[PDB]
Design a binder for this molecule. Structure first.
Ligand SMILES: CCCCCCCC=O
Length: 210
């Protein structure tokens, strides 16, 4: 019937990760409703299941020297970047066995958010995440353990898109990355993007937000 939204604001990746795991435990135990965490991270690169050292353009020592944190994680995908101005959403939801369906629902929610801004976005038949033309507006990479999801999505609102140039994803993809700011030619308030994401999730999943 319901999902809980928690706005964590700006939180370091490591502690936010530990929080994800604690939230996940409670949902698995049936002691917390499905939970959508909304937040930002300080500049961080994460390397998922498919990731290798060639997903990094520079040596990894360079990243830490230049203001990035770097972590190896168990989510789908290879490399991604999170940083200020990017709305990171961690839906920690009792999805069961239907992971592909859950991914499609996240995609749909993001497509709805973009539509609210007058932007035509699509999952694309062939590339993970949500795209506007040849550019990726939102990365998506989930993990599921004991039938409950963690990690999630990363919607570019006012992201510093220049920070993506130092990472080199592998596989089938479009040409670039984009943000609501870049597409609209002006910054979009983070509090507003959060509200619209909540509204979109409520609609797609058919749950009332608390
Ligand atoms: C929380 C968003 C994670 C997105 C990871 C997708 C990377 C694709 O290869």
């Amino acid at each position: 019937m319901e999902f809980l939204v928690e706005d964590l604001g700006l939180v370091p990746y490591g502690e936010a990760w530990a929080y994800q795991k604690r939230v996940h435990r409670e949902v698995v135990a049936g002691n917390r409703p499905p939970t959508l965490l909304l937040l930002e991270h300080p500049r961080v690169i994460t390397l998922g299941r498919k990731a290798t050292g060639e997903n990094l353009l520079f040596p990894e020592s360079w990243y830490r020297e230049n203001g990035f944190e770097l972590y190896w994680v168990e989510r789908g995908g290879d490399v991604t970047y999170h940083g200020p101005g990017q709305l990171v959403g961690y839906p920690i939801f009792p999805v069961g066995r239907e992971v592909r369906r859950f991914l499609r629902q996240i995609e749909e929610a993001i497509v709805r958010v973009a539509a609210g801004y007058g932007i035509s976005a699509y999952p694309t038949p062939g590339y993970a995440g949500v795209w506007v033309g040849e550019d990726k507006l939102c990365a998506i990479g989930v993990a599921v353990k004991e039938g409950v999801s963690f990690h999630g999505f990363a919607l570019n609102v006012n992201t510093d898109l220049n920070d993506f140039t130092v990472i080199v994803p592998c596989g089938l993809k479009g040409k670039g990355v984009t943000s609501l700011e870049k597409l609209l030619g002006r910054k979009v308030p983070m509090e507003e993007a959060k509200a619209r994401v909540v509204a979109a999730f409520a609609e797609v999943f058919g749950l009332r937000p608390v």
